[PDB]
Write an enzyme that holds these catalytic residues in place. Sequence first.
Site, PDB file in Angstrom:
ATOM      1  N   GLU A  51      29.829  52.704  34.069  1.00 15.39           N
ATOM      2  CA  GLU A  51      29.566  51.807  32.941  1.00 15.39           C
ATOM      3  C   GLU A  51      28.101  51.615  32.580  1.00 15.39           C
ATOM      4  O   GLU A  51      27.212  51.779  33.420  1.00 15.39           O
ATOM      5  CB  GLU A  51      30.176  50.430  33.196  1.00 15.39           C
ATOM      6  CG  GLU A  51      31.673  50.446  33.336  1.00 15.39           C
ATOM      7  CD  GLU A  51      32.114  49.850  34.631  1.00 15.39           C
ATOM      8  OE1 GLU A  51      31.409  50.055  35.644  1.00 15.39           O
ATOM      9  OE2 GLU A  51      33.165  49.175  34.646  1.00 15.39           O
ATOM     10  N   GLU A  88      33.919  52.431  29.542  1.00 13.91           N
ATOM     11  CA  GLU A  88      34.869  51.563  30.207  1.00 13.91           C
ATOM     12  C   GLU A  88      36.337  51.912  30.000  1.00 13.91           C
ATOM     13  O   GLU A  88      36.744  52.372  28.939  1.00 13.91           O
ATOM     14  CB  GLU A  88      34.631  50.127  29.753  1.00 13.91           C
ATOM     15  CG  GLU A  88      34.869  49.097  30.837  1.00 13.91           C
ATOM     16  CD  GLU A  88      33.930  47.926  30.705  1.00 13.91           C
ATOM     17  OE1 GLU A  88      33.416  47.715  29.585  1.00 13.91           O
ATOM     18  OE2 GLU A  88      33.685  47.219  31.713  1.00 13.91           O
ATOM     19  N   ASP A 122      34.160  46.412   4.692  1.00 19.62           N
ATOM     20  CA  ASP A 122      34.138  45.870   6.050  1.00 19.62           C
ATOM     21  C   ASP A 122      33.584  46.866   7.080  1.00 19.62           C
ATOM     22  O   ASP A 122      34.327  47.437   7.883  1.00 19.62           O
ATOM     23  CB  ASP A 122      35.560  45.436   6.437  1.00 19.62           C
ATOM     24  CG  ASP A 122      35.625  44.711   7.770  1.00 19.62           C
ATOM     25  OD1 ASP A 122      34.594  44.204   8.258  1.00 19.62           O
ATOM     26  OD2 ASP A 122      36.731  44.633   8.334  1.00 19.62           O
ATOM     27  N   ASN A 137      38.933  50.067  32.393  1.00 17.74           N
ATOM     28  CA  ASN A 137      39.464  48.780  32.871  1.00 17.74           C
ATOM     29  C   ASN A 137      38.401  47.718  32.613  1.00 17.74           C
ATOM     30  O   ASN A 137      37.508  47.494  33.442  1.00 17.74           O
ATOM     31  CB  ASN A 137      39.783  48.843  34.363  1.00 17.74           C
ATOM     32  CG  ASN A 137      40.434  47.556  34.878  1.00 17.74           C
ATOM     33  OD1 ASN A 137      40.203  46.483  34.319  1.00 17.74           O
ATOM     34  ND2 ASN A 137      41.243  47.594  35.921  1.00 17.74           N
ATOM     35  N   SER A 147      40.303  45.201  16.599  1.00 15.83           N
ATOM     36  CA  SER A 147      39.435  45.114  15.427  1.00 15.83           C
ATOM     37  C   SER A 147      38.082  45.786  15.660  1.00 15.83           C
ATOM     38  O   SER A 147      37.445  45.593  16.705  1.00 15.83           O
ATOM     39  CB  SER A 147      39.189  43.651  15.050  1.00 15.83           C
ATOM     40  OG  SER A 147      40.395  42.977  14.793  1.00 15.83           O
ATOM     41  N   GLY A 148      37.618  46.500  14.638  1.00 16.54           N
ATOM     42  CA  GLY A 148      36.353  47.200  14.721  1.00 16.54           C
ATOM     43  C   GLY A 148      36.509  48.495  15.555  1.00 16.54           C
ATOM     44  O   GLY A 148      35.561  49.286  15.689  1.00 16.54           O
ATOM     45  N   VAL A 172      37.300  45.295  35.461  1.00 15.24           N
ATOM     46  CA  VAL A 172      36.869  45.786  36.783  1.00 15.24           C
ATOM     47  C   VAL A 172      35.723  46.774  36.635  1.00 15.24           C
ATOM     48  O   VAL A 172      35.747  47.659  35.778  1.00 15.24           O
ATOM     49  CB  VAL A 172      38.019  46.511  37.489  1.00 15.24           C
ATOM     50  CG1 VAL A 172      37.574  47.228  38.767  1.00 15.24           C
ATOM     51  CG2 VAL A 172      39.151  45.573  37.903  1.00 15.24           C
ATOM     52  N   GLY A 206      41.896  42.281  18.476  1.00 15.34           N
ATOM     53  CA  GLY A 206      41.282  42.706  19.738  1.00 15.34           C
ATOM     54  C   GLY A 206      40.897  44.175  19.612  1.00 15.34           C
ATOM     55  O   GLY A 206      39.943  44.642  20.251  1.00 15.34           O
TER      56      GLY A 206
HETATM   57 CA   LIG Z   1      35.154  48.231  33.469  1.00 16.11          CA
END
Ligand SMILES: [Ca+2]
Lengths: 223, 223
Positions: B62, B52, B84, B54, B177-178, B57, B175
């Site tokens: 994908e 991915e 972690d 976007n 994160s990870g 969209v 966001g």
């Molecule tokens: Ca997408």
Amino acid sequence: IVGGYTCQENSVPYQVSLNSGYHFCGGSLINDQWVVSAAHCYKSRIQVRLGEHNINVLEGNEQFVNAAKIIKHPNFDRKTLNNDIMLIKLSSPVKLNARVATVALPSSCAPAGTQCLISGWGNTLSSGVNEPDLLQCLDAPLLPQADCEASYPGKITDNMVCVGFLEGGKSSCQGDSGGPVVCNGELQGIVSWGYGCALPDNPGVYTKVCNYVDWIQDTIAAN
Amino acid sequence: IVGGYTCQENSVPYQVSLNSGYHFCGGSLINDQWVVSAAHCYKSRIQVRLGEHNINVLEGNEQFVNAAKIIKHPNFDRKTLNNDIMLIKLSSPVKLNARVATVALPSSCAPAGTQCLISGWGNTLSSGVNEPDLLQCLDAPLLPQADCEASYPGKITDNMVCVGFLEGGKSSCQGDSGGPVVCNGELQGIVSWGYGCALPDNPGVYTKVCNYVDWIQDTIAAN
Ligand SMILES: [Ca+2]
Ligand SMILES: [Ca+2]
């Protein structure tokens, strides 16, 4: 704010929303033409939105006024966020009522243990992002200086004060920045900085307003 | 990410998106059936989205696969965020191509000075909140431990590593994160914690992956 609750419709009439195409910070009405916020929330063009609950819907009891003059604290330190306070003069006096009202400046510095209310439309998730529509609230004490130092060693000045919990996963966050902290009917702090939503298990650090009452007054007088 | 640039379409073929109704974290594909992320990004029901750019969209290249087993590190400390790291087994092997590829595990620990790439769909503003559609990128160096200690006194363990700047208003955020952190073609870190977008003028701290290669291997073998 994470781990908080949606505030009762217009239960925090002194809360304003700094907008520049999108909400970015919070502040407080101190009189019918002056708002107080954090210096790091400074922008060249700011519109103040008052009497709002659902920031994404026109309820009818709102007022929008542009900023005529934005005055940051002369000694603001962008690096340590010291003296993180700023005043904003509105282009037109706002019509005070039940939905839109002021808040008092501290007559003294609130001692440790004092209960306070934190409000704002900040992020409400510990993982991910979410900008609530409705104004969130959180009740949190004012921790002793010792607790404030333990979490942010050698980073706390005399003009900062900690408020929050060390566990429970409740805390202020980005978006709530510049927003009020009212303890005993008076404004005691301003959402400045801290670990935020990510590490909710740490108290946040706010500007100690009881130190700038003189400045605020003299500023409002000369302008 | 703040003060970064929009990655070139599909230039980070190993970046995945942990989605649970909404994007909440990032992770890295390490084979056709396993993903690596942060242990604090743990959720009981996660859908991994691959290939991915976007996130809002459908582009055509994908792949969406559910998590069949989520394994957090046994010694994960939710208080200090030590150890972690977490592994995710997919329900079905993903079809690897040009848009969906893997990333290698560290053969050695990267020394300070090394340049790395951090990617993610996290917050992009230092004041307010903004979830980007396009994957953001940021180039930052791996800092000496000393630089990490000073920013977070007594909070750094042998299983964490600093990456970022001390100024320039550039940093990872919630966001992200990870999210991966590739150095010299290998995964050297996982976006764990730090001051984030709020105070970008501070390095972020990440999990030191080079310490868990054996764990990852034994885990993938036994499951
Ligand atoms: Ca997408
Ligand atoms: Ca409204």
